[PDB]
Amino acid sequence: QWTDQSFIEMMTPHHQDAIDMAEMALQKAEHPELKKLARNIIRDQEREIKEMKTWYQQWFKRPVPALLDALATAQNFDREFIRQMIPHHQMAVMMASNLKTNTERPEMDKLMDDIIRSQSAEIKQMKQWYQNWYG
Ligand SMILES: [Ag+]
Ligand SMILES: [Ag+]
Ligand SMILES: [Ag+]
Ligand SMILES: [Ag+]
Ligand SMILES: [Ag+]
Ligand SMILES: [Ag+]
């Protein structure tokens, strides 16, 4: 079971990976649906990293401890982007749901709701797009 401290420690690099993937999409994605999704992921998840970073220092009096090829060389970026981003998002929703029943902090509770709602929604849309484009 996650604590607020451990959650931020794992979710931050996790969110940062989604952001980096999304950055590639801005250059490498062919579907405009994906570029839109990418800008959303970048905006929402960078905001959440900033919030988590800020809260971590207030609560724990120290900064957040600092702890490819299929996507890089790819000729079919849009396809492999979704293949990666779906289970990635599912992992975030899973971690957020876990913390949500353990946490006592109202700001963590609300952040979990955002992660769960926004990323579940992007999962639905990506599955539908995968079906339309590659089904
Ligand atoms: Ag994440
Ligand atoms: Ag990745
Ligand atoms: Ag790339
Ligand atoms: Ag993700
Ligand atoms: Ag995890
Ligand atoms: Ag298409």
Distance (angstroms) between ligand 6 centre and the Cα of 79 equals 10
Neighbours of 14 (CB within 10 A): 17
Distance (angstroms) between ligand 1 centre and the Cα of 99 equals 13
Distance (angstroms) between ligand 1 centre and the Cα of 15 equals 3
Residue 58 CA to residue 130 CA, distance in Å, equals 42
Reading the block at residue 3, the tokens are 């604590």
Q: What number of CA atoms fall less than 13 Å from residue 5's CA on the CB side?
A: 8
- The SS3 of residue 30 is coil
Distance (angstroms) between ligand 1 centre and the Cα of 33 equals 21
The domain 1-135 belongs to what CATH superfamily? Ferritin, core subunit, four-helix bundle (1.20.1260.10)
Q: What is the resolution of this structure in A?
A: 2.1
Among the bound ligands, name the one nearest to the CA of residue 87: 4
Neighbours of 58 (CB within 10 A): 9
Contacts of 28 (CB under 8 A, 6+ apart): 74, 77
Residue 78 CA to residue 81 CA, distance in Å, equals 5
Among the bound ligands, name the one nearest to the CA of residue 17: 2
Distance (angstroms) between ligand 5 centre and the Cα of 5 equals 14
